[PDB]
């Protein structure tokens, strides 16, 4: 069940969310990005209102404990914002479950940047710099979740190729904006379902197809 | 809900210290956020976008609340709690 | 599915009256109600005084 990204022997699963927004604001008044409590500074500074949402990752945390191959621990996630902070995950992590505790966990973004577990040894959330192919190999199939290609389901997409080292996905989190989809690593984009979807349900579709193809 | 004075306040686990024991029950199960997240994923699911559902939520207090497939729940939690007592008092909200 | 937005008001109190759209009739709605409850109060009190 243990897994780091140096686990090059068998197939893994990678989920990366792109172009988020979490860079804490300081008025000793010490807040993160939101869209309910404070918005006057967000409308005075010129930033767009609907982009400001840490609720996207706070609701995407189903991917932390969704996969029933946690007896191998196949999942690894990564986030990206304009700052460029990235976060490595544990498949049997203990996440702050509610929004106010996850939102109080903002010094991890700002200045702490290094959290450890109960034995003070395992860095549960790791902020190693870009890219991702320093950690996972180049043997991972290139798909990003977009809104234009004909849909191919994740079950058939996984059961096509058998023993590549990883699988990866790049999802988007915005109001509307063309994400940098297939310029960095990806080349061909897989379309989502035949309706406009959200980030959490896109991650749910990907992981449900992945676990249904891996047969848990 | 709890009409305190001022006006309503919802019942979460995290919105106070001891209103759960003040009403006379346990703060360990004061859990409406999993209801909010579960219902928003059920609403934003693609089969709900195709319209093959109808979501009956309920509580321990015997009430039965039907939501349509066409409900756009507010995306945040504070606006959701602001909608919740409008539902729990007026028993009917419009489009 | 054609999707709609639920109309409601922030910090919704049933005891308080709702958010009046029109300011030109908000005060007459407040006063044609107040006047009625105060008229009932003064008539009830003067007839209790009479009895």
């Amino acid at each position: 069940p243990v897994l780091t990204s140096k686990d090059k022997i068998t197939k893994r699963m990678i989920v990366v969310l792109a172009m988020a927004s979490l860079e804490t604001h300081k008025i000793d008044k010490y807040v993160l990005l939101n869209c309910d409590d404070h918005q006057g500074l967000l409308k005075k500074m010129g930033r767009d209102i609907s982009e400001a949402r840490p609720d996207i990752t706070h609701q995407c945390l189903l991917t932390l404990l969704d996969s029933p191959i946690n007896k191998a621990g196949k999942l690894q996630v990564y986030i990206q914002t304009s700052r460029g902070i990235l976060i490595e995950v544990n498949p049997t992590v203990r996440i702050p479950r509610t929004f106010k505790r996850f939102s109080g966990l903002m010094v991890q973004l700002l200045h702490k940047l290094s959290i450890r577990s109960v034995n003070s040894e395992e860095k549960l959330l790791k902020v190693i710099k870009n890219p991702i192919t320093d950690h996972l190999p180049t043997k991972c199939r290139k798909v990003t979740l977009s809104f234009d290609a004909p849909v191919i389901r994740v079950q058939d997409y996984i059961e096509k190729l058998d023993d590549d080292e990883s699988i990866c996905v790049f999802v988007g989190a915005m109001a509307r904006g063309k994400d940098n989809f297939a310029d960095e690593y990806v080349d061909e984009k897989v379309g989502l379902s035949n309706y406009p979807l959200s980030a959490s349900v896109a991650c749910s579709k990907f992981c449900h197809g992945a676990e249904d193809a891996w047969n848990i | 809900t709890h009409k305190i004075s001022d006006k309503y306040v919802l019942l979460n686990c995290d919105d106070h210290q001891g209103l759960l024991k003040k009403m006379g029950r346990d703060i360990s199960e004061a859990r409406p956020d999993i209801t909010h997240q579960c219902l928003l994923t059920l609403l934003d699911s693609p089969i709900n976008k195709a319209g093959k559902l109808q979501v009956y939520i309920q509580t321990s207090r015997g009430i039965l609340i039907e939501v349509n497939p066409t409900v756009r729940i507010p995306r945040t939690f504070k606006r959701f709690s602001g909608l919740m007592v409008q539902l729990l008092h007026k028993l009917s909200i419009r489009s | 599915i054609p999707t709609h937005a639920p109309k409601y008001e922030e910090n919704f109190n049933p005891d308080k009256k709702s958010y009046d759209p029109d300011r030109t009739r908000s005060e007459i709605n407040k006063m044609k109600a107040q006047l009625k409850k105060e008229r009932k109060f003064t008539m009830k009190e003067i007839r209790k005084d009479a009895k």
């Binding site: 209102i49 406009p196 | - | 937005a5």
Partner: peptide
């Protein structure tokens, strides 16, 4: 409405209108 919601404010609009009156 694709993946968002509505947004409005409190009586600061009436405060700006009262400053305009």
């Amino acid at each position: 409405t694709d993946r968002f919601k509505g947004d409005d404010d409190i009586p600061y609009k009436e405060r700006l209108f009262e400053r305009q009156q």
